[PDB]
Scaffold this active site. Structure first.
Site, PDB file in Angstrom:
ATOM      1  N   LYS A  23      28.098 -31.118 -30.404  1.00 16.22           N
ATOM      2  CA  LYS A  23      28.668 -32.334 -30.976  1.00 16.22           C
ATOM      3  C   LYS A  23      30.069 -32.624 -30.421  1.00 16.22           C
ATOM      4  O   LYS A  23      30.482 -33.784 -30.339  1.00 16.22           O
ATOM      5  CB  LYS A  23      28.729 -32.232 -32.497  1.00 16.22           C
ATOM      6  N   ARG A  98      33.174 -31.828 -45.559  1.00 15.14           N
ATOM      7  CA  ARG A  98      32.331 -30.653 -45.404  1.00 15.14           C
ATOM      8  C   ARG A  98      31.629 -30.380 -46.731  1.00 15.14           C
ATOM      9  O   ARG A  98      30.663 -29.617 -46.792  1.00 15.14           O
ATOM     10  CB  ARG A  98      33.196 -29.452 -44.984  1.00 15.14           C
ATOM     11  N   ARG A 133      26.839 -15.554 -25.955  1.00 11.66           N
ATOM     12  CA  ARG A 133      28.228 -15.602 -25.513  1.00 11.66           C
ATOM     13  C   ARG A 133      28.772 -14.208 -25.288  1.00 11.66           C
ATOM     14  O   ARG A 133      28.593 -13.339 -26.139  1.00 11.66           O
ATOM     15  CB  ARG A 133      29.103 -16.258 -26.574  1.00 11.66           C
ATOM     16  N   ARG A 166      31.834 -11.331 -29.347  1.00 13.66           N
ATOM     17  CA  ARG A 166      32.714 -11.558 -30.482  1.00 13.66           C
ATOM     18  C   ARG A 166      32.000 -11.209 -31.787  1.00 13.66           C
ATOM     19  O   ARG A 166      30.775 -11.324 -31.872  1.00 13.66           O
ATOM     20  CB  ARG A 166      33.202 -12.993 -30.490  1.00 13.66           C
ATOM     21  N   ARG A 177      25.557 -18.181 -41.165  1.00 10.64           N
ATOM     22  CA  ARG A 177      26.419 -19.364 -41.054  1.00 10.64           C
ATOM     23  C   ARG A 177      25.601 -20.630 -40.753  1.00 10.64           C
ATOM     24  O   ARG A 177      25.964 -21.737 -41.161  1.00 10.64           O
ATOM     25  CB  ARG A 177      27.510 -19.157 -39.993  1.00 10.64           C
TER      26      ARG A 177
END
Ligand SMILES: [Ca+2]
Lengths: 227, 228
Positions: A23, A98, A133, A166, A177
């Site tokens: 986005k 949110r 990642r 990470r 999440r």
């Protein structure tokens, strides 16, 4: 005869999209084509802390006490941010609202929204985009196990030092999440879907297939805004 | 005239400042006050690649090859970027031109720069602002030995794992980059002061004391930009 600047109708957008949906890329594209402000919460907070403004002084106070930023307060920051000259033509909200109370405070603060644009990408693709990642911590060089792999697995190309994943990019954290994203979002849309107010307007909900070429995602968005 | 207004002249700015000078913060502030696009080279490059543009495709190939973007190519990228609607009212260039050939190429393009704004901060302060940076790699949590210290030296507050200094944040490298910036900047100022171009105008050079509060630094900038 030099008075030939016409102020066109305000373009005011809430942009929604999961971690990994891309986005942020669409936001820049919209910003640049329609000449409106891309307002992302992360940026807005940091800029506010740096300003030395009373708003910034109060925020820095809160964050040093350990307390999390309230909904009323973050929307107060938004209202101020959009009073600025670069928002003459409208804006794109990226990170707020949110929650329902945030949306309610926008309504009460008199902030109108024309569109809600949701960049929808399949969970599995989202998962892969985050979990792949890698990073070389000393230099910060980024890799992705599928999209941008290193010459030798798990090693930095330049130094040969090991890469890490990470902490938040582990699969379980991503999926958790992700779930709270979809739930927090579904409530937001139904709120806006059953929007009823006397202070602001009912935004048009737009759902975009984000699993296409970037230039195609953009055109689908463009086609919808013009409808 | 019914909701019609005076088409003002666009404002175009080259913003200069060493690493740690806080130029990034002032750029956003200028952008929001004057409604002009903040164009930083880093973002511009990432966006152009992610765009699927034909120019963006070529750029991504140059970079995937591990090659460097030439002076000519970076200005071609600037040319595409400033043709967008958010640049109709002007823009602020941040990170370009860094070299004389970039400034010359910029001039051949017909880009007229109204102001050069240099955010000036003493070297001792700049060095300190960078060298005292520490990060917790696994989370990305960042700290500053002076400006935002960790509760225990070399340790992450939240987990307790060790903190590191990024490799380019070492003093030897920081000084070297400082020396380069100052040298390139001198050349640039010189170029624009002795500007004898037929195609573009002579920019107004503004030097700003960046060692003040953010709000005071901005007001100094506004003060100079707003002069007749
Ligand atoms: Ca603008």
């Amino acid at each position: 005869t030099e008075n030939l600047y016409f102020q066109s109708n305000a373009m005011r957008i809430i942009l929604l999209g999961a971690p990994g949906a891309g986005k942020g890329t669409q936001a820049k594209i919209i910003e640049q084509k329609y000449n409106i402000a891309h307002i992302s919460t992360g940026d807005m907070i940091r800029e506010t802390i740096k300003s030395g403004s009373a708003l910034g002084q109060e925020l820095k106070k809160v964050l040093d006490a350990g307390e999390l930023v309230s909904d009323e307060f973050i929307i107060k920051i938004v209202k101020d941010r959009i009073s600025k000259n670069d928002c003459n033509n409208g804006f794109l909200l990226d990170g707020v609202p949110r929650t329902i109370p945030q949306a309610q405070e926008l309504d009460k603060l008199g902030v109108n929204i024309d569109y809600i644009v949701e960049v929808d990408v399949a969970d599995n693709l989202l998962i892969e985009r985050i979990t792949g990642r890698r990073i070389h911590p000393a230099s910060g060089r980024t890799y992705h196990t599928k999209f941008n792999p290193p010459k030798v697995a798990d090693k930095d190309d330049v130094t040969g030092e090991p890469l890490i994943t990470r902490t938040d990019d582990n699969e379980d954290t991503v999926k958790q999440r992700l779930s709270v994203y979809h739930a927090q979002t579904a409530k937001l849309i139904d709120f806006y879907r059953n929007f009823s107010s006397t202070n602001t307007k009912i935004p048009k909900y737009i759902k975009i297939n984000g699993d296409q070429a970037v230039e195609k995602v953009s055109q689908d968005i463009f086609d919808q805004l013009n409808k």
